[PDB]
């Protein structure tokens, strides 16, 4: 029998292990010869696995390399412009890996060059709210200074837009072990942990969900018209760049001028942790001085698109998607969720070599470019945006499988918790003392649900990978899945973007039999399974209405902090609750009769009704100035890319609006998003009445 | 047998007279007890008639009205500032209504109110041509002046438009003979010609497709949150006024200044046409004043909305609507085709009544407001714009019937060419000297395309109807037909939003028999019929790659004027052709299998391939500054919203482009809309290749 078991049974461990051994003994860099290779021989190889149809699609996109012989660097410069102390120009490679070629230095992605001097200033994770307190509270002005952050917290993009708005002309990104180094751990080679001398790369853009800078809304193909520079979406106007945490004590030892405010301002490094702005007494005339060279360059990339088209309606698209390019060896970021889209086609193309094929088709992709910008989806979304919003069913994304070893995380949308929950207690616990269990069982004592006894957490859907154009953009279902650490106990994981990211970090310390990796191949393939055949798609419109008033209670809250403003401005959520409690009952309704109809036309109106649910919650204006963040109910948090934030209009409206210099109109807005999002709640309830 | 023939049999010219004649007895203007009195008789002979529902859908939106007991006029004001010539209050009424109430007296809808005072200046019909020959040529300044143009060529708000940017206080508009008095014609009450104390009602707005000024992308429903009138769209920021040709005549006899520069200035009135400004020697110090006090003022307004629920696509929509506002009896504009709507209506309920329901849902709509800026349709469309793009087949407008007598004339998508020669060879001929002849070969003979020979002339849908939310903004395949004059011997009709426009009008000058009424019920209702009942949707994509080869000659065309800049800026035209021939290829290759596949599934998929094809060419981002138009190929002409332009983005970029200061950018722009054009077309193609 073809069924779900046996597409689960297909899947073996040590297939997904030496795929990602595979996947991970030379750097696979976006743009470059080597991850041009591996694309080819992911193509080939989905052919030989069976699949219909794989393809590269090609793009050319605006990336991003520091200059191989003008080396990027940082310097405590004297009074005589003499440069006393310099960063690291590389990381001390890994055991075995000394004499690789082509491991890129760190660097932040896309930062301008310059080489600006100047007095630091240290901002913490320079969240929003950090420099609420330099400015407003500690009275310290950031405009001309270089400013130190450390990673954390937020998208690294976030803190450069919020330094390039206090006025700063340069930004220096560290590690700190108090973010990057677990306590009794060994640093890599000898634990998980992050060495002095550890670096993270990552790009630093703020691209509201553009894709390629010079192109957005449009594939950047052969004859793509790009804009110049000066026009380009999200690059930063100041210089940027990461260092460890051996290079950062030395910059920030010196420090003078105020101290921090309070103790979640310090580190773990043995400094003061000063503000600033500059450096205590008989350092007063020393300044850092930052020396960036990168280049920006349009650059060729490769999608690889597998088919496995469906038996009944081909015209039906479940799509699993996760990137292959990665900042060096990629050891889990991305090739540890790689290797496991590569075992899951293995297993689907056994079936189809039997005779089987699924219901709906299936699209198969390997990204490019994502380390860059969610670049090679984006694009390929934007070439393909009409087939996917009239026939994309569902989008699971497949980065990183492991980031700690504890229990599963999910992120997703509301429509698919049911079928999240119904899969996960089919499937075994990889965990220790859960022997004979369920993976729900495991994970719901492990990660329990905030608001439900015996259900497990999941979470919203942020953003900050590939399935940011499907989800905030053209409103495809979405969902994501890894194993994650224990959020009590424990910032990502400590090695992330480093050169120390191999396959022996994943084999020796985070998975040696690989069955954490087997778990999430079963969740990730078993969904894919699922949604592309199930007669009746299996999304349940209930578990939004639920989730809707929860979101509604929240905003509500918020915006009651300011009662008297809400009396001055008749500012009403009735609507809203009104809109909330509509959905609600016609969801009820549609349920009843999705439960209660071999008639094809009734069904397949029926599984439209289900496809187009989530289609409907986009509003083809966007929000205010994110015009390719078109989800009224969910966008990337504004501070922070990484997080996802619910009615983000009306969110955004109240945001520190107490601070507004004319309330009337800021209050205005607030009342103006209410009503977008009560007439986006009742128009998506609608589409789940009676047809006719 | 319950087939095409049966319902058009069923069509009777005696109904549709006795359906005008009730429709056409009081005012219906937009906004009025007496246009909610008739909605509520419309809604209730629906449900008599069979439909499965009929509701009223209500919104509150911006109208203007004169102020019954301030009235607007115009006059000629000595330099003691006495008022020597007024011109009229109302129009004299015609026989036997001359005590009828609540007749609106002529006014330009949404003017702002003021009383400017000034010299005059004469602009022909205003068109951007007539400005650029004023202001480049004659060295004519219209700063500071008030503008008198003639009714004609363009639409009227395009006019006031361009009087604005030109710098003009004030606009009188004014109907010349030479345009609405046909020669050896007598007037109403004795002919159909326009009388000097006539006047042309209507709005001078420029929406550019929003709906309510007030409530741009949302339905303005009870909780909607408005727009400050500062902020609302396409208000006029002068004064404006209609007049008939007595009280022109007054206004431009004594005109000065410069001669008109030619023939084609010249109307038909015993006057120089001198442009000014101002008058001759002896009248030099006396200048025209006007006087407007008008008011805008949020509304309710009510469509009707009748349901026929198909038996095996309920789920898929065909749409027949048409407006029933009107600005004085309505007698062509719209009852004329608002009751061939409701003779249709009766037709299909008939039918319904003895067992037979359509294959999809058809609904029919009396829309409200038309008159004030396609109100009632766009705030409808608007609130269901989720369920009419997944789910809109077509919509089929029904404004008024007739505008002559002598042949046929249909605008529509490409997509509708076929079915439309089809249908029409099925019918007969009303014309005289044709019985026993086909309405194909009547209208082929009298309107001949301009390319082929033996087919007849079909145009490409311009704007100023209800059409314009269903195809410029959603990308539903829509058409339009009606009896018309022959251009060749003869702008609109004569007696167009005029008192004088009536039931007796038509029934004696127009159409006595009503059976020019009964040929365009029979096609508006045979279209409706095919496109609601035949298995296969009634769309021939081959056609669309014929239109798209002769738009694509046509924009390469005018570009090709400037060889130098082409050369100079490297603009090509290849990607564009390209599209276009890979567009024609794969649309050859969906035909055959088309005609080459009982399998509900393949022909469902194939059906949504035609339903969703006009739906590929809409763009999210809009074209340039007008985001409501979305439409790639079609859009409104930005000089005239009555005229459709092809491949509008490219034509606006390179229109008037040699006056540009920065050609380096105005050539860029141009590339850009090639790029976005060869885009849509190639992404329209692909959703005709196999699914996978
Ligand atoms: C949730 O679903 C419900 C339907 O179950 C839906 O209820 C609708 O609410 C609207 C808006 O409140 C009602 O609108 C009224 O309609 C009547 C005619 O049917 C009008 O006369 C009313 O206007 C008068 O009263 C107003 C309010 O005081 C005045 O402002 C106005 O000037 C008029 O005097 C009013 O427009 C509508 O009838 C119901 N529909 C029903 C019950 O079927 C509700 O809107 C949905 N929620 C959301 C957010 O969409
Ligand atoms: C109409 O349909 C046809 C398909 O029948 C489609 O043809 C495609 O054209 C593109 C763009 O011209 C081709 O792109 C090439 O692809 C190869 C790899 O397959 C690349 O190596 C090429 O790049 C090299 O050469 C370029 C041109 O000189 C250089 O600029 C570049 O730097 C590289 O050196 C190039 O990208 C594509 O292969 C075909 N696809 C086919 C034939 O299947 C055409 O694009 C369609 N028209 C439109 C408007 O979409
Ligand atoms: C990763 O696995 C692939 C697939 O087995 C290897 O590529 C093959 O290499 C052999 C021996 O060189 C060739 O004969 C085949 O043509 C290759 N097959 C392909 C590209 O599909 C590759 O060597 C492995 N890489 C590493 C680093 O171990
Ligand atoms: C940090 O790096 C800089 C750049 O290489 C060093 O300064 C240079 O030293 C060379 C050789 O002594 C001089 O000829 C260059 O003119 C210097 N360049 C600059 C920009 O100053 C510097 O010595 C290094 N500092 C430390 C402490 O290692
Ligand atoms: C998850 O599993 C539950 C329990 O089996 C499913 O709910 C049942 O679905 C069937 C089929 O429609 C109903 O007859 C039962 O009444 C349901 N039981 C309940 C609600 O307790 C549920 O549909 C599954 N969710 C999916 C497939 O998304
Ligand atoms: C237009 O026709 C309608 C429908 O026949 C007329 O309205 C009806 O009037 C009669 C007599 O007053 C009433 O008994 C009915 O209740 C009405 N039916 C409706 C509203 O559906 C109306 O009188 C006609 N109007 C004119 C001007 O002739
Ligand atoms: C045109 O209309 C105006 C406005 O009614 C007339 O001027 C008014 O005449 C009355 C009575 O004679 C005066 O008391 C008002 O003060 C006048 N108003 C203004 C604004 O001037 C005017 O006489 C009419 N002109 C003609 C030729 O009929
Ligand atoms: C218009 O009528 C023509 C002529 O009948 C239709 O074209 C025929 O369609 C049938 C059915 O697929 C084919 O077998 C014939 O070969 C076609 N004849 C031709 C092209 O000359 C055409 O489909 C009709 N158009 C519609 C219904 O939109
Ligand atoms: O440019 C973008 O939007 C993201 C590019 C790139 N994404 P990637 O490193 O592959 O994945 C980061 C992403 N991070 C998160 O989901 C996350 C979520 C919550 C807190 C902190 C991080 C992930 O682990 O999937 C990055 O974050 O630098
Ligand atoms: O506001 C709008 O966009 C249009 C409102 C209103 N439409 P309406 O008068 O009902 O119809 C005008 C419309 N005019 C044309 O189609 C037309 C087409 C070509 C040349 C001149 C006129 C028609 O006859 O359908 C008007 O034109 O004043
Ligand atoms: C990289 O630096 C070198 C050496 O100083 C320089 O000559 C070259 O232009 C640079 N490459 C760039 C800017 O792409
Ligand atoms: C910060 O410093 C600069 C002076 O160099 C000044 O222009 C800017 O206005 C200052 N901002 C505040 C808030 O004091
Ligand atoms: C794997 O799990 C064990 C047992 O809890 C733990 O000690 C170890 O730190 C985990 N490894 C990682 C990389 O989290
Ligand atoms: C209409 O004009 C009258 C009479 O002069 C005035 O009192 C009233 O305010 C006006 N109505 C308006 C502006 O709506
Ligand atoms: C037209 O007239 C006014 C003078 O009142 C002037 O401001 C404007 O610049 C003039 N325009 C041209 C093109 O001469
Ligand atoms: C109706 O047709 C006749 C015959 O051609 C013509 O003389 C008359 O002008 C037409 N009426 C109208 C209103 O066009
Ligand atoms: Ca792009
Ligand atoms: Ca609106
Ligand atoms: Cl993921
Ligand atoms: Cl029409
Ligand atoms: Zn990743
Ligand atoms: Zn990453
Ligand atoms: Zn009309
Ligand atoms: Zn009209």
Known sequence: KHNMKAFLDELKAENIKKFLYNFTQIPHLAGTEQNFQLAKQIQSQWKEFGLDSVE?????????????????????????????????????????????????????????????????????????????????????????????????????????????????????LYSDPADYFAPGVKSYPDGWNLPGGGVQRGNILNLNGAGDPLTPGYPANEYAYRRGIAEAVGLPSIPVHPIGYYDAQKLLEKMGGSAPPDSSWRGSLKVPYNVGPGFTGNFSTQKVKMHIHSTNEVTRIYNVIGTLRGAVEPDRYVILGGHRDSWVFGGIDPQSGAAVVHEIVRSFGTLKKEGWRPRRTILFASWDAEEFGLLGSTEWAEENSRLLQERGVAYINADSSIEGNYTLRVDCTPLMYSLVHNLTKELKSPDEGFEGKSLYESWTKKSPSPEFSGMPRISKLGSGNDFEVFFQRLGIASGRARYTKNWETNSGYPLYHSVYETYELVEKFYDPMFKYHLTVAQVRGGMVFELANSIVLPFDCRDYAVVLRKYADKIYSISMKHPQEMKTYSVSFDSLFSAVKNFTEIASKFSERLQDFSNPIVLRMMNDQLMFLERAFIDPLGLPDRPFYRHVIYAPSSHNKYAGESFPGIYDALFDIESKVDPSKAWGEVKRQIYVAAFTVQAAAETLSEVA
């Open 56 to 172: 590269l699609a090609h793009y050319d996109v605006l990336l991003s390399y520091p200059n191989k012989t003008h080396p990027n660097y940082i310097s405590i410069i004297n009074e005589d412009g003499n440069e006393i102390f310099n960063t690291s120009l590389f990381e001390p490679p890994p055991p075995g890996y000394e004499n690789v070629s082509d491991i890129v230095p760190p660097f932040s992605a896309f930062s301008p060059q310059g080489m600006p001097e100047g007095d630091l200033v240290y901002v913490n994770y320079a969240r929003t709210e950090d420099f609420f307190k330099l400015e407003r509270d500690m009275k310290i002005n950031c405009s001309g200074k270089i400013v130190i952050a450390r990673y954390g917290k937020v998208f690294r993009g976030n803190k450069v837009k919020n330094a390039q708005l206090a006025g700063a002309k340069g930004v220096i």
